[PDB]
Every structure is written in C-alpha cells, then in structure tokens.
Amino acid sequence: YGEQSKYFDLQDLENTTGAWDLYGVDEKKRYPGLQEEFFQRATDAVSRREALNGFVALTGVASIALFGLKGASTLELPITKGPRMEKTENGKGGILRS
Amino acid sequence: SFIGSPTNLIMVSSIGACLFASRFGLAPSVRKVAQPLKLSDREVLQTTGDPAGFTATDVLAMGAAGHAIGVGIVLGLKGIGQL
Amino acid sequence: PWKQPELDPDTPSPIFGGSTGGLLRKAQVEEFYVTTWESPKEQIFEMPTGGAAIMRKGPNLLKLARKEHCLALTTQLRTKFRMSPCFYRVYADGKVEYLHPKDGVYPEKVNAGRVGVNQNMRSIGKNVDPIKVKFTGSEPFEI
Amino acid sequence: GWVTFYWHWKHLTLWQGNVSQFDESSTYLMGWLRDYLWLNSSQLINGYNPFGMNSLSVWAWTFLFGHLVYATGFMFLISWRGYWQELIETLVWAHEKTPLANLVYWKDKPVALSIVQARLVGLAHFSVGYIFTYAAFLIASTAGRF
Amino acid sequence: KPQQVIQPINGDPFVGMLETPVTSAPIVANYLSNLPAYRTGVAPNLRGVEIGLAHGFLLAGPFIKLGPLRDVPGTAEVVGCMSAAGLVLILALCLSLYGNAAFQNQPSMGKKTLSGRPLPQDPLMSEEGWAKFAAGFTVGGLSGVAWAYILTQILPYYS
Amino acid sequence: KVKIAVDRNPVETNFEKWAKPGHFSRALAKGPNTTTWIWNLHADAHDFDNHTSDLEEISRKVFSAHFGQLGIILIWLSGMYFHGARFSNYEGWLSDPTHIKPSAQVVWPIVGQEILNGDVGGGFQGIQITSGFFQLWRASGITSELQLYSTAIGGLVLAAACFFAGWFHYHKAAPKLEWFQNVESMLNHHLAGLLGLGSLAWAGHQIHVSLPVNKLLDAGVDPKEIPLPHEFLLNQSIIADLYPSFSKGLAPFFTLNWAEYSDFLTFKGGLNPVTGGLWLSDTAHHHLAIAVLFLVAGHQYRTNWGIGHSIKDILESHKGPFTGNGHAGLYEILTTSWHAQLAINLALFGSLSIIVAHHMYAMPPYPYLATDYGTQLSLFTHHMWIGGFCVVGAGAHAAIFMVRDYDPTNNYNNLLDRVIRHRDAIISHLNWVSIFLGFHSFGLYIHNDTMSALGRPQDMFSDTAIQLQPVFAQWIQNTHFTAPQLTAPNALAATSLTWGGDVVAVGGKVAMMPIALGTSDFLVHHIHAFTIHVTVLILLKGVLFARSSRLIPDKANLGFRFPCDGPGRGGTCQVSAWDHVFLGLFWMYNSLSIVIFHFSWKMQSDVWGTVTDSGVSHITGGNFAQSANTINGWLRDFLWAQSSQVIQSYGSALSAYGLMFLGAHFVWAFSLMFLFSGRGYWQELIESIVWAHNKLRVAPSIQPRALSITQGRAVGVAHYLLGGIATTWSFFLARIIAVG
Numbered sequence A: 001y002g003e004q005s006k007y008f009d010l011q012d013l014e015n016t017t018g019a020w021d022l023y024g025v026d027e028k029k030r031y032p033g034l035q036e037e038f039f040q041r042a043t044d045a046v047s048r049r050e051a052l053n054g055f056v057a058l059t060g061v062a063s064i065a066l067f068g069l070k071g072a073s074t075l076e077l078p079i080t081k082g083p084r085m086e087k088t089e090n091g092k093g094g095i096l097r098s
Numbered sequence B: 001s002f003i004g005s006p007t008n009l010i011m012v013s014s015i016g017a018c019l020f021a022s023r024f025g026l027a028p029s030v031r032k033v034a035q036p037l038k039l040s041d042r043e044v045l046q047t048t049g050d051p052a053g054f055t056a057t058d059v060l061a062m063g064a065a066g067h068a069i070g071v072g073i074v075l076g077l078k079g080i081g082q083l
Numbered sequence C: 001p002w003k004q005p006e007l008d009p010d011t012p013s014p015i016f017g018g019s020t021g022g023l024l025r026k027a028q029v030e031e032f033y034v035t036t037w038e039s040p041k042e043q044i045f046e047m048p049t050g051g052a053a054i055m056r057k058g059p060n061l062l063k064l065a066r067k068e069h070c071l072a073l074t075t076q077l078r079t080k081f082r083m084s085p086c087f088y089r090v091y092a093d094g095k096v097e098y099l100h101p102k103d104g105v106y107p108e109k110v111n112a113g114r115v116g117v118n119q120n121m122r123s124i125g126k127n128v129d130p131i132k133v134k135f136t137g138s139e140p141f142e143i
Numbered sequence D: 001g002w003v004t005f006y007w008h009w010k011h012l013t014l015w016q017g018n019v020s021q022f023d024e025s026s027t028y029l030m031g032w033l034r035d036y037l038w039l040n041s042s043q044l045i046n047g048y049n050p051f052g053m054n055s056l057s058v059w060a061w062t063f064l065f066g067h068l069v070y071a072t073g074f075m076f077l078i079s080w081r082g083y084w085q086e087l088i089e090t091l092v093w094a095h096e097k098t099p100l101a102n103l104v105y106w107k108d109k110p111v112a113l114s115i116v117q118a119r120l121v122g123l124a125h126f127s128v129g130y131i132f133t134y135a136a137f138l139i140a141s142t143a144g145r146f
Numbered sequence E: 001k002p003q004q005v006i007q008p009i010n011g012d013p014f015v016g017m018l019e020t021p022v023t024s025a026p027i028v029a030n031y032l033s034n035l036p037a038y039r040t041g042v043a044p045n046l047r048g049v050e051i052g053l054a055h056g057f058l059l060a061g062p063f064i065k066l067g068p069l070r071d072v073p074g075t076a077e078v079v080g081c082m083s084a085a086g087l088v089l090i091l092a093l094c095l096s097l098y099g100n101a102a103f104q105n106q107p108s109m110g111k112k113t114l115s116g117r118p119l120p121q122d123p124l125m126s127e128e129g130w131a132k133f134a135a136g137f138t139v140g141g142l143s144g145v146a147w148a149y150i151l152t153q154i155l156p157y158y159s
Numbered sequence F: 001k002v003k004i005a006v007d008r009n010p011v012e013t014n015f016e017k018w019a020k021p022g023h024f025s026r027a028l029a030k031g032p033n034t035t036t037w038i039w040n041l042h043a044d045a046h047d048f049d050n051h052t053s054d055l056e057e058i059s060r061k062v063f064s065a066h067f068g069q070l071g072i073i074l075i076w077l078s079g080m081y082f083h084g085a086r087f088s089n090y091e092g093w094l095s096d097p098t099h100i101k102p103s104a105q106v107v108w109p110i111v112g113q114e115i116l117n118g119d120v121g122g123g124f125q126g127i128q129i130t131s132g133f134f135q136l137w138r139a140s141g142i143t144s145e146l147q148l149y150s151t152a153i154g155g156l157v158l159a160a161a162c163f164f165a166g167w168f169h170y171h172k173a174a175p176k177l178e179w180f181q182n183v184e185s186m187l188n189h190h191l192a193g194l195l196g197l198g199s200l201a202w203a204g205h206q207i208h209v210s211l212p213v214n215k216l217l218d219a220g221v222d223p224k225e226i227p228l229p230h231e232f233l234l235n236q237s238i239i240a241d242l243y244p245s246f247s248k249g250l251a252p253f254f255t256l257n258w259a260e261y262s263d264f265l266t267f268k269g270g271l272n273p274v275t276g277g278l279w280l281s282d283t284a285h286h287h288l289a290i291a292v293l294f295l296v297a298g299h300q301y302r303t304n305w306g307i308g309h310s311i312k313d314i315l316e317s318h319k320g321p322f323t324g325n326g327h328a329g330l331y332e333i334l335t336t337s338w339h340a341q342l343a344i345n346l347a348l349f350g351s352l353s354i355i356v357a358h359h360m361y362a363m364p365p366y367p368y369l370a371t372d373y374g375t376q377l378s379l380f381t382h383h384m385w386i387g388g389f390c391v392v393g394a395g396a397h398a399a400i401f402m403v404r405d406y407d408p409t410n411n412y413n414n415l416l417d418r419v420i421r422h423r424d425a426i427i428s429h430l431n432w433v434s435i436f437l438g439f440h441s442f443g444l445y446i447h448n449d450t451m452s453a454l455g456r457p458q459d460m461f462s463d464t465a466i467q468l469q470p471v472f473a474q475w476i477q478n479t480h481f482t483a484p485q486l487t488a489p490n491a492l493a494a495t496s497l498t499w500g501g502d503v504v505a506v507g508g509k510v511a512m513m514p515i516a517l518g519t520s521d522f523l524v525h526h527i528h529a530f531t532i533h534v535t536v537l538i539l540l541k542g543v544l545f546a547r548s549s550r551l552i553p554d555k556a557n558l559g560f561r562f563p564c565d566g567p568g569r570g571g572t573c574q575v576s577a578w579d580h581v582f583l584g585l586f587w588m589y590n591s592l593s594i595v596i597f598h599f600s601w602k603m604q605s606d607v608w609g610t611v612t613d614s615g616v617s618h619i620t621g622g623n624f625a626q627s628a629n630t631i632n633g634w635l636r637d638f639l640w641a642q643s644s645q646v647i648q649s650y651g652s653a654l655s656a657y658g659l660m661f662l663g664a665h666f667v668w669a670f671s672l673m674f675l676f677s678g679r680g681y682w683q684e685l686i687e688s689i690v691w692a693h694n695k696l697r698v699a700p701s702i703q704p705r706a707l708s709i710t711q712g713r714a715v716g717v718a719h720y721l722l723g724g725i726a727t728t729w730s731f732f733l734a735r736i737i738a739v740g
C-alpha cells in the first residue's frame, strides 16, 4: 500500500476503502487500579440494557408522578397557586358574559 | 514656493534626490523593472540625449513621485509645526 | 471482450490533492467501484467528484463511490480524448464485478452475442388495465 | 376561506348592529380587508401585550403558530428535492467525517423527502397553519367583543 | 521547497479527509487521542463514567443559572440540578436505544489505525459493550450532577 | 503593446435580421412550431454565449449592450430633469423646503385621477415624489427651471450620442478581442480617468458653483436674487466675499499653503443645522481627496511604458503554503470569461449599493433630506433592494461561469480548484453556523413570544428582563463619538449623529438624533446575520455544485439552466444552479424585507419625529425597546400600528398607494400558482383547451404549450418578487407620506 503511486491492493482492503482511525490508541487501564472496581461494581447491576431501560423508566415515571403531586406546590410553581381575582367577565363590546 | 522658502528647499531636494535615484539604477524606472529587490536592467524606447534610460516617461514619473513625496513631507512637517 | 480482464493492484493512480468529495463509509460497509484505463501520455482531466488531476502515462486507477461517477468519467474520457476506459465494482468481501460491457464493444453496438431481456413484443399502450391484474402481484408492464 | 369570511363578517356586522357597514363595505376589496382583517384583529393581537396580558393569549399565539406552520408549508412547497439531497449529502459528510461523533452512526440512511412526500408535507403544513390561524383569528375576534 | 501543508490523508487523494493543520497538529492529535471515547483498550463502562461525569457536570450550569426559579434564592441550585439529572436520564435512555438500534448486527470490517496494527474489535462497537457504556454514562452523569450540587452548597465564590 | 485594434464594418446596418425575430440562435432560426419558441426567443435574446463561440463578437455585443443601457439611463435621467423643469414645484420648494412637500409628477384629469394631484403646497398639485431629486438639485446649485430644461436637453443629446456610439462601435467600427483584453489600460483609464476625472470635476463644480449657492441659500436669501453660478465662476470679487480664500486666487495651491483654504474645504463632523445635510465644504474636500486617491491609484498598472504593475505577476507572486498555487491562473480566467468579471463586478456593485444606502441613512448628504423622511426611507430601501439584486445576480453569473467558462486545464492546484476540492467542508460548516444563528436568533424570538404569552415578562430576553446588551456596537459608537477628541483631533465633531450627544432639527422636525442600541437591536442584527448567512449558503452551494456533485456527477454537461435530471435518485428536482439562484432570490427578499422593516421601525421609533420645547417626541411612542423582542410585538406594533393610513387612504391623495398595495397583494398571491404547481397538469389543461379550439376550427398554427419548468419557476419568482417589492413600497410610502 502506497509504494510509489498505488492506493489499492485487494488483500488489505481495510486500507483501500479509507477506513482509518485518525485518533485511536490501545493503552489499557489508564486510571489507577483501585478506581475501577468502585465504578465497575457500579455498572454491573445496570450493565444489561434491560436493567438500564427499566432503571431510567423507574426513575422516570416515579419522578414524573412525584412532580405535580408533590413536586409542585413546594417550589411554588405558578400552576397550583390559584388566582386572587382575575377574569370573571369577558367581552369589551358588551354582553358581559359570566 | 518663494525662492528661499523651506518648502521650496524641500521640493527641490526631493526632486533632485529622485532624479539622482533614477539616474544610476537605484529606482524602478523605465529601464529597471522591479522585482522585490528591483533588478534585470531592461531597455525600451530611447533616452534621447543623455545616457541610461531617462525617457519622456522616466522624468515624467519621477517628477510626479518627487512632487508627491514633497507634499507628504511639507504638510507632515507643517502639521507637527516644523518649517 | 474476447477475455474478461482482471484489474491489477500494481497500477498507479493520478496525482491529486485532498478532495472532500470522494469515498465514504459506504466504501467500507457496502461495495465501491474501481475504474481502469491505459494512457498514451500525461493529460489533465476532471474527476466527477473532485477537481482536476494530472494522470499518469500508462495504466491508471480511479475509485468511485458510485457507478454513475464511473460512467460520467468514462463518457468524459471518451468524448475528450477518445479514451475508451472501463470500470469495475469491488464488494465488501473482496468480490470483483465487471459491469462495463461484458461483450466489450460497448452498449452502442450489438455484437450478436447478447440476449434480449425485459422486452415486450406488444406496443406501448396495448398493456392491460390494472383491474385485470388486480390482486395478482404482477404489474401490467411486467407481463 | 371565502365562504367563512363572508359568513363571519356578515354575522359580526349583524351582531354589532351595523349592517349598513357590511352592505356598503363588502362591495370593494379594500373595505373587506380594512373592516374584516384589520378591524376585528385589534383584540386578537393584544393577547399578551407587554403592558397587559389577558385571556386572548392562546389565540394570538395560535394565530402566529398558524402563520409559522403556513410558512413551513411554503418551505416545503417552493423548494423541491434535488437541492436538499446534496445538502443532506454534505451533512452526511459532516457527521461521518468528524471527531467525537463518527462513533455514532445512523442505521437508516438520511435521504431527502420524496417529491410526492414533499407535496404531501407541504400541503399538510399549509392546511394545518391555515386552519389554526383562521380558527384563532375567528374565535378571538368574535369573543373579544362578545 | 513548497511546504505543501495541505495534503490528503495517508497520501490518498480519493477519500474524504485531507490532512490539515486542524487535524495534523500534534497537540490536537494528542488531545483527541487521549479523550476517553478514543481509548480503545479501556472498558466502555470506564469510558462512560468519565464522559457522563464531564457532561453531567457541564449540563447543570445552564439549568441553575437560567432556570425559571433562578430568582428564588436557595431553590434554584436544587431545581437546576434535578432537571440536569432528568436530562441525563433522558440522554441515557436515548443512548440505550441507540445501543439497541445500531448493534443488532455484527460489524465485519476493522478500523485500521495508521500504518496498520489494528486490534480485533472495539468493545464500544458491540451491543453489550455499548450497554455498559450507557450504564457508565448514566452513573457518571448522576454522580456529576450530585457533585455540581454539593459544589453549589460549599463555595468560596459565587455558586 | 497596448493599442487600439478595431475592425471596420463587420455587420451591415440593415433590418434583415429585424425581419426574422429568431436569428441569434440556430435552434430558433427554424420557426415557431410551439409556443415555447417565443419564451426561448425572449430568454436567449441576450445570452451571447450560445449565439456564437467567438469571444470577440461576444465582447462587441456586450460593449454595445452597455452603450444601449447607458443611453437608456441617460434618457431616463433627461426625462426626470424635464419633469422637474416642467411639471414640478421646485421654485416653490426652494423658497420653503420645510413646509412644501416635493412633487414632480402631474397626472391627467382623465378618469378620477384628480384626487391623486395632492395639495403639496406652494399653489401646486401633483404626485408627492419620494426620489429626493429636489434635495439633489438644492445640493448641486440649481435655481430656475431653465437650468433643469438645459440639463434635460443635454441629457437627451448625450443619450442620442451614446446610442449612436453603440451603433458605431458595433456595426461601423468594432474593436477586436485584444482591445478588450487590455485589462491594465482598462483599469488605469477607469481609475484615473473615469472615477478620478469625475471626482475632480464634481469637486470643482462644488467649489465654484454649489458652495456659493448653498452659502446664500441657508442665509435666508431668496433664490431669485441669488447670482447665477457663472457670475461666481468668472468674477473673483463675488466669490471673495463669501469665501475670503478666493482673494488669494490659487496662490496657496501651488505654494503649498493649503491651510489657507480652511473656509470652503473644511473638515467638520456632523450636519449643517440650517438645512440638516452635510456641509458642502466637507463634500468639496471629500471629492477632491477622492480625486487625488483615484489619480494616484490610476497609475499603478503597466500598459505601454515599462513602469507599472503586471496583474499576472502580482497574482502569481502571492503564493502561500496552505493554498498551494496562489492565484496562479486567475488572470487567465478573468481575461477570457465575461461571466467571472460579471460576478465580481455585480457582487462589489451590490455590496457598495448596500454601503450607499447605509451611509445615506447615517449621514444625509443633501440639504433638507434628513427632515424629508420619505426621501430617506425610499433611498435606503431602494438602494438596499438594488444591492441585493446585484449580489444575487453576481451569484447567478458566477454559477454560469462555473458551468460554461470553467475548464480544468489551466487550474490544477490553485485557489479555485482547492475551493472546488473542499466545497463539502465549506457547505457543512456554513450549514452549522446557519443552524446555530437560526436557533439563537429566532428561537430567542419565539422564547420571548412564549414568555410574553405565558405571563412571565421577567423571563424574556428584554432590557427589563435578562438582556443581551450589544457591547461591541455600543463600544464602537462610544469610540466614534470620542474619535474627534483624541484620534482625529482636527475634526470639529463626530462623523455622524448616530453616536453623538446632540439633536439637530430643521423646521420643528428631528433631522438626526443619537441612536440607542439594546437587546432588540441585538436580536434583529443577529437575525440579519443568520438570514444573510443562509442566502450566501444557497448561492455558494449553487455555484460550487454547478459543475459536479455526489448526486449528479455529470451536471456540467447538462448546462446551467436545466429543470432536472428526472425523478431518479429519489427525484433531482431544482438541482441546477439556476434553481439555487431562484431560491436565493426569495431568501434575499426575506432578508431585505426584514432589514427595511427594522430600518423603518427603528428610525420612526428612535430617530424620526417632531421636536418640542419639552423634550423630543418621535413618530411612534418609542416602543422599539419594548415591542421588537417578540414576533407578535413586531407584528402588532409595526405592521398593524402602521398601515392604518394605507387602508384609509381612499378618497385622498395617497389612494393610489392603497390600490398599488392591493395589486401587489394580487401579484404576490398569483405567483404561488407558478411556484407550487408543475407542468403536466397545465399541459393537460392546455390539451383540453386545444381540443375546444379544435372543435370549431380556431386551432392556431403554433401549438399551444405549457410553460417550461424553468420558465414556470422564473415566472413564479418574478411575480412573487414584484408583488412583495410593490407591497412594501406602497406600505412604506403611504405610511411615511401620511405621517412624515
């Protein structure tokens, strides 16, 4: 490959099509050794996509149900507070409904 | 431009310096084409009298450049309060 | 042609600069196309996906992501220089296919060596209505 | 739109009691515009004015929403597929050939909307924006006065 | 001596990139190759831990600073953090969906680092590897959100 | 080397080619079999590339085409001068510019048009004009209608001379290709000669003619007893009292004592308080300095006398390593392609027209022009749109050069070839910055609209709420305001009152006042940047992908203006660069419409108004800082708060603006047929109509055909642009006339 002008050889077609990792290294365990098993045990219970999709949905539906029922009115969101006295009548051209 | 004024002296010295600069190499005249360092000594038309290449357009351009440099020097010195 | 030619890995390629228009990840995943020709001298041509490239005296090699690029380059070469090149297809597993004439004397000629395919002996407009071929899976023009 | 413009303006002038205004103003189109699309839209656009905001805020927002969806329909309707395919190809080269995002790759190849699909989505945005902006204007104009 | 800085990659004028000083700079190449997403020998969960930590630490900021309750003192710093945690959970769900979608098949062609020497397979390019990567991403995002929360509680400056 | 190569009598002067309308094209020389022959006739009428492949005949054709356009413009200018001479109130306007509205078009009493002859004052009735010709005729010192008559007759004479010159320089004495290829002589003669000679002549006219007339005009002297400019020209005594430096009599010019000319060649910043325009002495020194700068720049290139610069050497010598071959072949392209030079000249002309509009709205160069709000708004909007059109045409003709005159032989590794090489990177980065600007401008607008609608104005992007203060523009304003203090100590005041601290006013109306920039101006300016980036993306993509693309590799062989390559590859509709320009025209329209809406609203809300003793009151209530942050605020407080005079214009002097408004609505709406629809449905409808005409034997010999797809797109964009332009024109003019 690339001897004087050739860019194709058909036995190293991994080089012919242009598949190149411009930024790729194979250095293993760059972080210190005691640091992995704290996080390796963190992931192993949620490593499966079934365990992770459930956990995201578990924290999803519960916290969404927490909002509004308990999440609102503690932050004083302006949806569960109520009016003082606004907008009983309507109609500037007369009729004055409600 | 009264004879004896500093502006007249500046103008005449600029004109004479420009003719000296164009007489013997040393300026991008009609004889000397200009590279970044102005070489190769070509020849076109004729000098009509004195040697080198002082043609009708050589003294016309150098007089124009010498006059135009003089307005920069005189008005520059006038703006800063000199002569 | 008389014998089906196989492209040579050794053949050179024209000098060219870096062009953004070129081979993509479809070259890696799916198939890609390769064009070959033999040159008499060094001439300047325009690639169908890039700019201008000076080609090599002798054999040459172009890789195009699409067959349309290959035939556009072929038509450009044949029109400009009476060049008559040929292109191929290289699959992901390394399989090589020959699409530019298997008979070798171009689709413009006949050569009395190819069989008529997808040809209807009936006139256009003599085809039956879609109701007559409804719920059958066959189109009126496919009959 | 013509039949509902006629109905809404005639009935609005009947309810307001000035049927002579409709009788002498529906003849010429400038009066049609001035006394229907401009006069009745005064209460519509004052839904969320910076000085004061009232219950017509959803109607002005829906009016502008219908304008925006109408304009997106125009986006699909004027331009056609073939300039969009090249732009999507350039975006494909952008995503496939960049650091920290070439690892994420699509499974369905991004292609431009087909011409029949283009007409369908342009008609869909056109009609959705048309309906929403007219419903917003009609309800706001009729309900602001009565 | 023309100094042709702009040249195609690997001397190949046929593919997409051309080697440019934005790409060919030693500082840029060393910084990108040392980023966690390009550490091929490291496990994808350890990739996701650092990636999620960085992204969950950065994503908390705009939610606290420009949130709807930013003018309320003491409560903006908790609302921004739990909204950032919710955003991290949403991104984790979409990451898991991408891992399901893009790795239902098996890749057959390697990456071919420069001048050869390619490893058998990136564990990130696998199904369970990307699932572990998304797990590391959500754990890192939650820990980064909590860290940005406690950094808004103890502080010598601002928040 | 440079000479005058001219071929004498190449084309006979006869009506032989007038007899047969289709003669320039061999395809149209057969006959009109279909109705598309007529549209191809009027379309390929001036396309000289496919008429012949010889560059010399094309150069002669375009030379006489420019001669004909110059004669047409001179005829138009002579007609305007004649209208100001005969049907105008210029004599009344000279004695009272602040109370008499300008008028130079008089309608006939034929059918109800007498209501259009509005009461403009001065005992005169007519159409209230907006071009600002009266301000120009007050700057260039003009007193009576006799002088305007003389100017009109001279313009007609020069127009006839220009038409005769075109006829001569094509049919009688046509220059050769080497005559047109003398680029150095062209540049020297149109830098020193055209621009420099015109600037020096205008400076001399201002010094000897316009300065005394304008000095006597603003002093309260009636124009009837003002001496004619030939008296000022011949007699030094009359010009000496108005300007004492004329008593020296050209002595300081040659003796280098130019400081003595500080009375009528002044360097003053600001406007004349009596009139509201720039000082004529400042304009005189300006045009004199411009003449100097163009006389010195017009002697740069080398033509015949050895000295000078060779443009090929300058281009080939600037080579830098990230560009490979640096400007290596561009001299060969620009000396052989008319379309490349057309693109460059049209782009620079359009941009310079944009600068012209901005720098007239900034510094009004005419007396009683700032207070005349209609003339200023019309000039800004008109030159705005003309600049946009020239830029779009520059993109179009660049794409045409790309398709036709571009060849890969001369360019291998130059800048043009490398721009072709990395075109995908340019388009992708432009798309990224397009999406980025679009989101954090228009999404900011939508978010402000939502927070207004949700009853939370404190969450908006406004000055009262969290703000995006344009610190860079305000710092530039402060620097320019303090520029005369330190960096330009010889300036009397600031170069414009955009950033000043004082308010000038003529006749009780504000001429020009300081402009404050806030969050809304930030939002609109970044909206403008987004819109211009999109339009330049469309034009640049059309230019770059005109030759080849990943979709259609053989787009070069398909021509420039082709409808499609068929429904293949999912449908390659509008893939040609012509359709890219067709979309860029609409994007231009949106850009310039929003720009002039910003101009009108900002100037009516923060600049224009009537000055009072108790502060300054503007035209509006100063609501730009409160209503320009939201789309609904923009709508209600600009398009609905205004245009109340257009709808009620009926029965008044400006009812024709309402008629023009509704006709523009009609044409804008009529265009969407040619935009949404296609051709096959219309062709089938035409077939049915052809059957109807066949039934009772009125079948035309020419077969009726539907318009072409490119033809239909052209009709749609033309009707759309004409309708939108006339809509904004009618609305702007009616609002600025009934109020300002």
Ligand code: CLA
Binding pocket: D071, D072, D074, D075, D076, D078, D079, D087, F431, F434, F435, F436, F437, F438, F439, F442, F443, F446, F534, F537, F538, F582, F583, F584, F586, F587
């Ligand atoms: C006002 C009308 C309108 C609008 C809004 C658009 C919008 C668009 N066109 Mg189009 N265009 C239109 C009419 C319009 N078009 C017409 C009539 C034509 C024919 C001449 C064209 C011709 C044309 C061309 C030739 C090009 C475009 C492009 C674009 C894009 C520009 C995106 C950008 O930078 O802005 C930012 C995005 C927006 C303004 C969209 C609205 C965003 C709002 C604020 C929502 C924000 C996020 C929101 C909360 C998400 C909702 C979530 C929900 C799903 C739950 C965008 C998709 C260009 C393109 O592809 O991009 C480079 C392009 O090249 N258009």
Ligand code: CLA
Binding pocket: F062, F063, F064, F066, F067, F070, F158, F162, F179, F180, F182, F183, F185, F186, F189, F190, F192, F193, F194
């Ligand atoms: C100093 C000499 C000079 C001057 C003043 C001009 C002036 C002009 N040229 Mg140019 N030109 C020149 C030398 C000159 N040319 C040379 C040497 C060449 C050969 C290299 C050309 C080749 C050339 C081409 C190929 C074209 C022009 C064109 C134009 C016109 C551009 C229109 C414009 O910008 O609006 C300015 C408009 C006006 C000022 C209107 C007044 C026009 C008056 C009547 C022209 C008078 C100038 C003329 C040189 C006088 C001598 C001519 C004499 C035989 C009567 C402009 C009038 C264009 C054109 O066709 O227009 C004619 C064009 O396409 N020029």
Ligand code: CLA
Binding pocket: F042, F043, F044, F045, F046, F047, F048, F049, F342, F346, F389, F390, F392, F393, F394, F396, F397, F400, F561, F578, F581, F718, F722
């Ligand atoms: C410096 C000015 C200039 C010059 C010399 C040219 C010259 C040329 N252009 Mg360019 N062009 C320009 C400006 C210019 N154009 C601008 C500003 C635009 C943007 C709108 C374009 C857009 C453009 C396109 C898109 C195309 C050209 C083409 C052409 C060629 C033939 C044009 C022709 O035959 O028209 C024939 C003349 C007409 C059709 C008459 C114009 C009628 C228009 C459509 C309507 C005008 C209405 C009017 C404004 C108001 C009247 C209202 C009505 C009710 C009466 C020729 C090379 C074409 C070509 O093939 O290039 C080689 C081509 O495809 N140009």
Ligand SMILES: CC1=C(/C=C/C(C)=C\C=C/C(C)=C/C=C/C=C(C)/C=C/C=C(C)/C=C/C2=C(C)CCCC2(C)C)C(C)(C)CCC1
Binding pocket: B015, B050, B059, B060, B063, B064, B065, B067, B068, B071, F292
């Ligand atoms: C040696 C000799 C001689 C002598 C000679 C001489 C001494 C000469 C001189 C000459 C000269 C000495 C010339 C000059 C010229 C100049 C010029 C031509 C310049 C200029 C012009 C003008 C017109 C100007 C302008 C301007 C202005 C107005 C402003 C701005 C600036 C300027 C300055 C540019 C004799 C013959 C006796 C004898 C033999 C030898």
Ligand SMILES: CC1=C(C/C=C(\C)CCC[C@H](C)CCC[C@H](C)CCCC(C)C)C(=O)c2ccccc2C1=O
Binding pocket: F673, F674, F675, F677, F678, F679, F682, F705, F706, F707, F708, F709, F711, F712, F713
């Ligand atoms: C309407 C339409 C047509 C049909 C339009 C045609 C055939 C052009 C008709 C031009 C007319 C004949 C010009 C003259 C108009 C009037 C006859 C002028 C009347 C003047 C009075 C004084 C009588 C197309 O061909 C078409 C093609 C492609 C895209 C869109 C469309 C499209 O929308």
Ligand code: SF4
Binding pocket: D080, D115, F563, F564, F565, F566, F567, F568, F571, F572, F573, F574, F678, F709
């Ligand atoms: S709809 Fe028209 S423009 Fe589009 S591919 Fe078909 S024929 Fe071409």
